[PDB]
Each structure stands twice: as C-alpha cells, then as structure tokens.
Design a protein around this ligand. Structure first.
Ligand code: FES
Ligand SMILES: [Zn+2]
Lengths: 168, 77, 52, 295, 86, 194, 119, 54
C-alpha cells in the first residue's frame, strides 16, 4: 500500500480538488497553529489536508508554518501593496477556514472561466501542424481534398516526372 | 549559400547580365499602377496601425477597464 | 554562471575599429573608375550596363 | 393586431412538453459504448428521491425541443465584378475568415470565380467550409448516403426514426433544405404507420405535433393518445389546433357550445377532422371502458 | 493461488447483504445510463431514516500500482497487449 | 476449384443447416487458436492466409470456410466481429483473422452502418450555433458600390490608359537600343480559340 | 534566436509531400527558414482543386490586420491572395499579366484564322 | 474606395451596431504623399565601402 496515514492526499486528483485560487496580491501566507488543544483542531486539519491543495493551485505563493508561537492559531496573508490580512481561525473547522479565505482573498467562478476561455484561443482548430499543437498536420486529411501520395498515388498528369518526360 | 570569404567562380569572371528590353507603354502604365496601389495600401496600413494603439490603450486606460479596477478595489475593502 | 572572460575578442575588436579609422580608403580610391574596362580598380567590380 | 402563437411561446412549449412526457428509462437508456465499472452509493429513502429529482432536471435539459425555423433564403450577392481577371484562372477560390471569436452566421466567406466575380459563398458552401476549419463531432463534409430515399426507408423499417433525426441534426442546420425534407419524411412515415410512440419522451415530438397541426394531420395522433388513456394530451392538441386556426369550423363551434375536455374531441371530429367517424368509435370505446373501472 | 482465490471469492459481500447490514439502498450509477439511480438491492428490514455521515477524506489504504496507473506513470511494454479471446 | 453458391446471396449460408452443424450458436472464430511461441503472441496477425490460390496450414476463421463472404449485406456475420456491449470492432489477434480479412470486415462494417443495415450508437449532439439570425451582411445583401452599378472597375488604374507621346519619348531616350515594340490597348475581353 | 536587423513578414510556408503542395500562411521573421519557426499561423492555402473544383484559402483577417499594424511586410504571393479575396487591391502585375495573356491569345487567333482561311 | 471585402465588413458592423447610413467608406489618401523613386535621399544615414582593396 501507500505509505503514511491518509495516503489519498498524495494524489493529483486530490490536489486538484482545491477551490482556493488566490489573487495576484497574495504573496506570502503564514499559518500559526498549536499542536495541542481542542480549539486548534481545525487548524491542524487545515495544515494536514488543505495546505497541499492551496499550494498546488498557488505554486508562486510562499506558505510558511510556525508551531506553538502564540496561544491561539491564526492565518496571516501578506499582500503586494503592504497590507496584512489577519484571520483568526480558532474554534473553527478546516472547511470553514477554506471557505473563509476563498471569499476575502480568493477568486470567484466568473474570473476563472475567463482564464480558461483565453487559453482556448491559443489553439485554433483551423491551424495545421503536429498533433501535439494542432489537430491536423496537412489538408490531405480533409475529405474532398487531394489525398497524400503516400496513401493514394497521384495521376501521371499531376507528377513532374511525366510532365518533364512528356514535354521533352 | 556562399560567404564573404569564399572566392568567386572562374566561369563568371566575364559575365554581364544585360538589362531587359522595355515596352514604353506597359512600363509607364505599370509605374502608375504601382504608385496608386502603394498609396492605397499605405492608407490601409495606417488604419490597421491605429487599431493596435486603441486596443492597447483601451485595455490599460479604457473606460470599461478603469470601471472594473475600481469595482475590484471596492470589493476588496 | 560566471562567464570566463574573452580578452582577445575585445582587443581585436578595438584594434580592427582603430585600423578601419586610420587606414580608411578615401573617395579617390573607392570611387576611381577605369574608363576602358569600366571597373573600379579598388574592388575590381564592373559598373552596371545602364551606367556605362 | 392578433398574432398566431409561435413554436417558442411559453404557452405552446408547455403544451408540447406535456404531450411528450418524461420517461427516465427511455431518456437514459443504456448506451452501447465503452464501459467503466459502476460506482455504488448507500442511499436512504430521501437521498434516493433527491437523486431521482436531479435526473428529472437533467432529462428536461435533454428533451429541450430544437426551434423550428423556415427554409433559409439563397445567398445571391455580388461584391465586385472584375472583368480583367477573366480567363486568368481555371478554378475558383474560396476565402474564409477563420477568426475564432466570430459567430459562423456572421462570418464572411467569398468566392472569386474564373470570370473575375467576387460573390458570397452559398449556404451549402458556407456550411461545408465551416466544417473544414471548425470541425464539429458528428458532421461530415460530404453528405452521407443514408439520407437517400432507399437508405432512409430501410431505417424506417427498423423503427429507427429517432436515429435519422439525430443524424440530421448533426449534419444539417435547422434552416436547411435537407433538414426540413428529412424531418417531414420521418413525420409522414410515422403518421402512415402510427409510430408516434417512438418519438415520445424525446425532443422531436413537439416538432412532429407542430407539423401536423399546421398541415391538419392530427387525426391519427389523436387516436393514438385516446388508445393510451391520454385524454389530457388529446384535449390540448385540439386546443392548440384551434389557437393556430381560430377561423375554423371546430374553433367556432367550441365557442358556441363552450366545449371542454372530451367535448372538444367530438366537436373537432365532426367539423374538421377527416377521420371523424373513426375518432368517435375509438373515443366511444374508451369512455365505455372507463365507466366500468369507475364502478 | 488456487486456495486463495476460492477463499476471497467466497468471502465477498453482495449488495443485498450490504443493504441488510446497513439498512440502506444500494444505488448503482452508470456513465452509460447517465445520472439515473438504479436500485440494485433494498433492505428487507426497517429502512434507516438517518444517512451515513459524509467523510471529507477517507482513511482507506490505497495501492500505488493503481494510483500510478491513473496518473499515467506506470509504463510497461507488457500491459494492455493485444491477446486472444478468453 | 471451390465455387461457393452463396456468392450473390451470402446471408443464406448462416441461416442454413450446414452452418448450424459446424458452428451452431457460437461465432465462427470460437474454435480457433493461433500457433506461436510463448504465452504472449505477436501483436499483428499474418498478412493473409491465401497466397497465389494456395491456403496455408492453419487458415483463419474467414479463410478456412469459402462460404463465408465478407459483404456489407451479411449483417449476421459482421455482428460476430463487433462487441455487443461497446460496439467496437475487435482487433485481429482477438478473433485470429488475418490483416486482409480484418480490413475487409471493417470496410463492410462501416459500409453497413452507412446504409442503415447495422445498428450503432448515434449520440444526441448540440447545435453548432447559439443564434440563428440571418440578418448579418455576410449572409444577406450588401449595398452595391457605385462602380458596380455603373459597370466600372473598382479602381480606375485597373483599366488601360494610353500614355501621352511626350512620356513615351522620355522612355525611348532613356532606353536607347534596348526597346520593344509598343503595346496597344488590350482587347476588351479575353479571346477564345474557335 | 536573435537576427541582425530584419523584420516580420506574412508569407507562405510550403508543406505537403512530393507533387502535393500545401502552403500554410504564417507570420515569421524575415531571416528565418521558410518552414522553420513562426510567430503565428494566419491561414492556409490549398492550390490543388478539390472534388468540388475550388481552391481553399483560410484567412485570419483579425490577426492579419494586427500584424500589419505592428510592422509586418507582405510577400508578393500573399499580396495576390488578398487581392483576389477583396481585402487588398488587385496587385498591379495581376492586371498586367492578364493583359499580356489577352494580347497573346489574340495573336494566336490570327495565325489560326489565316491557316483556316488561306488554307 | 475601400477594397470590396473590407467595405462589406465595415457596412456589417454599422448595421450590427445599429447605425443606419447610406454613405460610402472611403480612405483618406491625402496624407500619403507619394514621392518619386528618383528623389534625393539622406547621405548622412548611408554607409561607406569597407577598406578591403582587391
Ligand atoms: S501529408 Fe498532406 S500530402 Fe503528405
Ligand atoms: Zn485469413
């Protein structure tokens, strides 16, 4: 089996289940959690499950964690303008923390659709080329157009061998 | 193709490419067609050049772009 | 990522530029023309046939 | 003044939606395709009711009737005539604007003929050229040979009328001349062989009822509904018929007699329906049998 | 391999046993049939009114061989080879 | 020489008693096995089982019986090479047929689906366009340009214009000894060879 | 790659197999190879007639107008494809070569006529 | 005038945006001053032959 407890976390399907895509402002995210106490349980589960999901969607955002530095857990974001966003996550579940930071600092579903639509204009279907980039390589794959000579030999009248021989 | 340091062939030492014969009518008529064609294509080019400035200037300093930067900044506060 | 310097490539560049400015050919050499063979003795290049 | 309701009106869609009906077993019929192992969920009585409610919401998105349009007008528009280019080429050029962010019905497709004429591509040329640069799954550049009369009849013989309509919807446009002929042929065959049930619980039923009501061929359909204890749908079909044809013998008679429910079928059967006698006999049997059940 | 195959194939729980054990409906979901819920088994006894508590993450032991295949990492020139009908 | 009598009507052989006594209810390839080394066979079958009117040692299901004709009308035989649960044509190693007959089956299986003889899954696709209006100028009429109404070219320079004598005189002097015969105005329309 | 000088040009990039030419309109650097690296593909041209008898020319007008406003030049073959479409004016040599062919074909009708008349 | 297709696409934007007009689109070629090919150029941006006598 897969080593470690809850091995589903080490899967690409689970890392892509995150719904927290930060904005361009968010540069640094700091998590302060306490190893023990009932109140801090949500923060521990947020560091155990959701932090991998947040870092996978935001690979350019720094995420640093500190243990037992304060009496209560809290999240603090450092924006590019110099503003700091404190988020007291005590007496809260990990789902509440994940839903709270997606509303104050995360993107909505409207801004995310547009991003995907801008990437659909990069791969034009009309364009011809390798399968990696384009659907078709040549226009001989289109029914009606003259087929490739490899598959269907062209007529002797359309080849430069006989044209040269016929002319001279 | 050759480089600058490669010597010329010895078969081309005495080669003179004589200019083509000229038909006065066709030549004069074609010299005016080019004059107009290039004048019509310069005007079209300028139009296309002005559309690239606008779009560029309509996304960073546009009325619909500055109306969204304030909505995004107002929702942040 | 520390590029090893190429000193001879900078010395030659300066020397070549200097020589091009002290040995530069004049207009008398460049634009002289022999009127029988219609060539430029400096470069041995024939002029075009419409200029002869 | 007084406009006759169209096919997309809320009042008409609700009537044709109810006639169609909803059958999950037929709407979500097991497709023959590549398979994966199923997933199981331990559900309660209430979790199963919500799951069946979500399937009914998804079946109503799959039964969305396509709009019925009229035969599009041919494109005969010349942009330029250049007589100096005549004889300089043997074949014609077809230029297409393959700009992505443009609807295909606003896309410019021109044809430079060997006579120097720069015209607009015809509908058949537009649709074909749009499948070369914007290919759509299901559509083919060259019209398939199944839409021929001999091949279509073979399909009709196997009660595969819904497959002919699905192939036509994926090959032709709603306002084509081949999409309207292929549909009418299917509807005409259904009326002849009484195969109305095949299109039931599908998205092609409303269009079949709209073709009969406008061409006055609802006698057979009404009989089928009566023979399946569907009087509710049978009465709305006459009501819809009346609306589209207000100045008719049946419509005027109704107003005079204020006919309702089963009465409308009787009024319609005599005044306008071609097979008036058969409708009464079929309707009679139903009413007699219903009385026994009521007892 | 023979004594272990008969052992595991005899200790498998059916859908009816699962329903009776948990007093719930076993619903089959198929891509071919879309979202339609197919009830394959129902409890003969009293149907439970309370649903099973949803689990955010399940602590079930996984197999690297299966995770490595779904993520396109199990390269082998002997898998998915064309063979005869069995 | 084997001259099968079902050449024209191949579907009558599968509904006969000679077929039922040999195959029964199973497919024709049920009782066929390939001969090869190892447990893993080659990923491709033999090109063909018949070479210059000569059959090989172990003919395939289609080549061992000369009465089995791969035609698009013989739907009962083509259903044995298509899965009844996924509608996919089996690869050659599955049934054991040669590349030549597997290529002829695929063509007959694809040609029976194009004639409505073979049932196959036809999905319900969505419309190509979100709108259906035909009011745009691309599909409608454009105001004809003035030049098109007057029977004139789009631009004047398209037409030939005779140049003045003084200008031709400059060119002649400019190109002394390197001239060509002056060209007259071209014909209004392209001539054709009678 | 960095080239000394140069500019962008909307040209044709030859493709296809022997005796089956297929060009694909591209915007590419002047010094780059014909079929090498390109900035963008702006269309395709199939010279060979199809079953319907027509030559297909796909043009991304929106993107062709963008690169022309950014400093892109045009090749003669590509300036003759835009003249036939109606995007540009008919190239001067397209009008002059059509006149030369007329005079030529009118010169052949005389010889043919004389032969049939005199003989 | 604009060339035929460009003109057809400028008259379709108008009618799409709602503008109704019968005016022709025309190019202002008064700015474009077409100079002759034999017009004196700038010799102060022109190069000189390199000193490699042969
Ligand atoms: S690939 Fe198109 S011709 Fe060979
Ligand atoms: Zn064989």
């Amino acid at each position: 089996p897969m080593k470690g407890r809850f091995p589903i976390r080490r899967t690409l399907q689970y890392l892509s289940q995150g719904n927290v895509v930060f904005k361009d402002s968010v540069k640094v995210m700091t998590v302060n959690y306490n190893t023990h106490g009932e109140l801090g349980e949500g923060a521990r589960k947020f560091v155990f499950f959701n932090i991998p999901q947040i870092q996978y969607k935001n690979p350019w955002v720094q995420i640093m964690m500190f243990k037992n530095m304060t009496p209560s857990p809290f999240l603090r974001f450092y924006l590019d303008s110099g503003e700091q966003v404190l988020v007291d996550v005590e007496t809260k579940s990990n789902k509440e923390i994940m839903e709270h930071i997606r509303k104050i600092l995360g993107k909505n579903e409207e801004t995310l659709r547009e991003e995907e639509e801008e990437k659909k204009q990069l791969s034009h279907p009309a364009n011809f080329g390798p399968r990696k980039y384009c659907l078709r390589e040549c226009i001989c794959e289109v029914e009606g157009q003259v087929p490739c000579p490899s598959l269907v030999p062209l007529p002797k009248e359309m080849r430069g061998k006989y044209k040269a021989a016929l002319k001279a | 193709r050759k480089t600058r340091h490669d010597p010329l062939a010895k078969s081309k030492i005495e080669r003179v490419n004589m200019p083509p014969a000229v038909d006065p009518a066709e030549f004069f008529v074609l010299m005016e067609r080019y004059q107009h064609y290039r004048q019509t294509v310069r005007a079209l080019r300028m139009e296309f050049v002005s559309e690239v400035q606008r779009k560029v200037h309509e996304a960073r300093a546009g009325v619909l772009a500055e109306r969204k930067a304030l909505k995004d900044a107002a929702e942040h506060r | 990522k520390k590029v090893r310097p190429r000193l001879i490539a900078e010395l030659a560049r300066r020397v070549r530029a200097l020589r091009e400015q002290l040995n530069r050919p004049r207009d008398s050499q460049l634009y002289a023309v022999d009127y029988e063979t219609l060539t430029r003795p400096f470069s041995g290049r024939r002029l075009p046939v419409r200029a002869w | 003044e007084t406009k006759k309701p169209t096919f997309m009106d809320e009042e008409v869609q609700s009537i044709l939606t109810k006639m169609t009906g909803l059958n999950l077993q037929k709407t979500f019929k097991p497709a023959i395709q590549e398979l994966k192992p199923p997933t199981y969920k331990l559900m309660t009585q209430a979790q199963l009711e919500e799951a069946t409610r979500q399937a009914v919401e998804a079946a109503k998105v799959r039964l969305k009737m396509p709009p019925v349009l009229e035969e599009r007008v041919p494109i005969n528009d010349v942009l330029a005539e250049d007589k100096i280019l005549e004889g300089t080429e043997t074949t014609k050029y077809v230029f297409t604007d393959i700009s992505y962010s443009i609807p295909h019905r606003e896309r410019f497709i021109v044809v430079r003929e060997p006579s120097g004429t720069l015209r607009k591509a015809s509908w058949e040329e537009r649709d074909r050229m749009i499948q070369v640069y914007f290919p759509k799954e299901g559509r083919k550049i060259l019209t398939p040979i199944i839409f021929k009369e001999e091949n279509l009849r073979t399909m009709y013989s196997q009660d595969r009328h819904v497959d002919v309509l699905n192939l036509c919807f994926a090959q032709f446009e709603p306002d084509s001349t081949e999409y309207i002929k292929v549909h009418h042929k299917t509807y005409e065959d259904i009326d002849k062989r009484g195969k109305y049930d095949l299109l039931r619980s599908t998205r092609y039923f409303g269009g079949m009822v709209w073709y009969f009501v406008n061409n006055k061929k609802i006698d057979g359909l009404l009989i089928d509904q009566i023979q399946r204890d569907l009087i509710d749908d049978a009465t709305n079909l006459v009501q819809l018929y009346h609306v589209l044809h207000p100045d008719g013998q049946s419509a005027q008679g109704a107003k005079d007699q204020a006919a309702e429910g089963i009465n409308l079928i009787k009024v319609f059967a005599k005044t306008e329906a071609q097979k008036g006698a058969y409708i009464e006999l079929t309707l009679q049997t139903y009413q007699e049998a219903l009385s026994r059940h009521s007892a | 391999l023979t004594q272990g195959l008969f052992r595991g194939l005899s200790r498998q729980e059916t859908h009816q046993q699962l329903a009776d054990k948990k007093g719930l409906h076993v619903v089959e979901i198929r891509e071919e049939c879309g979202p339609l819920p197919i009830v394959v088994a129902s409890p003969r006894g009293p149907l439970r009114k309370d649903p099973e508590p949803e689990d955010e993450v399940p602590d079930v032991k996984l197999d690297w061989e299966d995770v490595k295949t779904a993520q396109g990492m199990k390269r082998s020139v002997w898998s998915n080879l064309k063979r005869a009908a069995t | 020489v084997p001259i099968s009598p079902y050449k024209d009507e191949p579907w009558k052989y599968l509904e006969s008693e000679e077929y039922q006594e040999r195959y029964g209810s199973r497919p024709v390839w049920a009782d066929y096995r390939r001969n090869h080394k190892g447990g893993v066979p080659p990923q491709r079958t033999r090109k063909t089982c018949i070479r210059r009117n000569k059959v090989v040692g172990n003919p395939c299901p289609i080549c061992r019986d000369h009465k089995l004709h791969v035609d698009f009308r013989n739907v009962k035989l083509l259903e044995q090479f298509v899965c009844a649960h996924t509608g996919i044509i089996f690869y050659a190693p599955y049934t054991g047929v040669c590349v030549k007959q597997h290529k002829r089956l695929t063509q007959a299986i694809q040609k029976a689906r194009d004639h409505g003889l073979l049932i196959y899954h036809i999905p319900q696709v969505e419309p190509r366009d979100l709108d259906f209006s035909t009011s745009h100028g691309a599909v409608s009429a454009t105001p004809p340009a003035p030049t098109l109404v007057s029977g004139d070219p789009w631009y004047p320079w398209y037409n030939w214009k005779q140049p003045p004598e003084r200008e031709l005189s400059r060119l002649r002097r400019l190109y002394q000894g390197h001239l060509q015969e002056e060209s007259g105005p071209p014909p209004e329309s392209m001539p054709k060879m009678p | 790659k960095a080239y000394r000088g140069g500019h962008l040009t909307i040209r044709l990039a030859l493709g296809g197999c022997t005796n089956r030419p297929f060009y694909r309109i591209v915007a590419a650097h002047n010094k780059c190879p014909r079929d090498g690296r390109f900035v963008e593909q702006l269309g395709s041209y199939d010279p060979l007639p199809n079953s319907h008898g027509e030559k297909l020319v796909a043009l991304n007008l929106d993107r062709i107008r963008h690169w022309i406003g950014c400093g892109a030049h045009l090749s003669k073959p590509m300036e003759k494809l835009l003249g036939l479409a109606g995007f540009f004016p008919l190239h001067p040599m397209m009008i002059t070569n059509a006149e030369r062919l007329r005079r030529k074909r009118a010169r052949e009708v005389l010889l043919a006529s004389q032969k049939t008349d005199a003989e | 005038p604009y060339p035929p297709l460009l003109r057809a696409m400028i008259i379709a934007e108008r009618q799409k945006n709602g503008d109704t007009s019968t005016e022709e689109p025309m190019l202002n070629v008064q700015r474009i001053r077409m100079e002759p090919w034999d017009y004196p150029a700038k010799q102060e941006d022109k190069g000189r032959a390199k000193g490699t006598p042969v």
